[PDB]
Amino acid sequence: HMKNSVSVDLPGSMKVLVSKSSNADGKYDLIATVDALELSGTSDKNNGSGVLEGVKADASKVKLTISDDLGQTTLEVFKSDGSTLVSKKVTSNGSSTEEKSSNGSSEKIITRADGTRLEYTGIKSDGSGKAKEVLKGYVLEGTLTAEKTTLVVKEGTVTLSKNISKSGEVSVELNDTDSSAATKKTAAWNSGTSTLTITVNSKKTKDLVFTSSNTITVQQYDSNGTSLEGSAVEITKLDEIKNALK
Q1: How far apart are alpha carbons 134 and 117 in whole angstroms?
Q2: Which InterPro entries match?
Q3: Which of 11, 45, 208, 221 has the most CB atoms less than 10 A away?
């Protein structure tokens, strides 16, 4: 594998072998095996960071780039002339983003460290596409535009929209076509508290909190809409989101 070497753990359970000492040019040798393909390179650092390359049996070019502080790996596959990416996987702090492009359409899967996922399919040149968020216990469906991702839950005449900016910032909104002004839902979003407060007939009815853990909780107000009551309950299934929208 490599004489006089040490092994270094990388993000995404990868490993690289680095020579214990440098060559006459001061550089260190790097060897890694990624899904059975051996990649090799050299680096002017001694810690496992740098660039390694290999070629698949179908002549595709593979490059692994390990950031200077070992915090991130980028694994790229190119067509045989090296000029066109076919796939790119970036992993850091237990999260991965995998992109593949072909025929003017792209796919992107973000796997979060908690196991939840954001999945984009059929991304077009204007930045639009289809979107899915895979949460613990339920899936949200929606769309992607150049502006934002919008995941939608509909219940009766109510539509709940969870928006995710390109930065990953979450905001939420509600629409309701209800013709009865006594039962129509409206809602206000508070970014500082990550809370959507729903109102019906001039009374706040519930707070939906969109947590840093990619969960949703719901807590009701009292019968006057002027104090919260009970304790917040974590939602675990799609039909529980819909119940909160009734």
Answers
A1: 5
A2: OM_lipoprot_Borrelia, OM_lipoprot_dom_sf
A3: 208
| Resolution of this deposited model, Å | 1.4
- Best CA proximity match to 172, nearest among 155, 156, 149: 149
CA gap 149, 134 in Å, rounded: 14
State the first-to-last Cα distance of the chain, in angstroms, to the nearest integer.
Answer: 62
3-class DSSP state for residue 229? Answer: coil
Experimental method: X-ray
Last residue of a domain, one of 55, 78, 101: 101
Last residue of a domain, which of 85, 101, 117? Answer: 101
Q: Residue type at 130?
A: K
Please give the Cα distance from 7 to 13 (Å, whole number). Answer: 12
CB 1: neighbour CB atoms within 10 A? 9
Contacts of 39 (CB under 8 A, 6+ apart): 31, 32, 33, 52, 53, 54, 62, 63, 64
Distance CA 21, CA 18 (A): 8
H or E, element range at 239 = helix 238-245
98 token code pair: 């995998």
Angstrom distance (rounded) from CA 66 to CA 35: 16
Size (the chain), residues: 246
| Alpha-carbon gap, residue 120 to 144, rounded angstroms | 7
Domain of 150, CATH number, reads 3.90.930.1
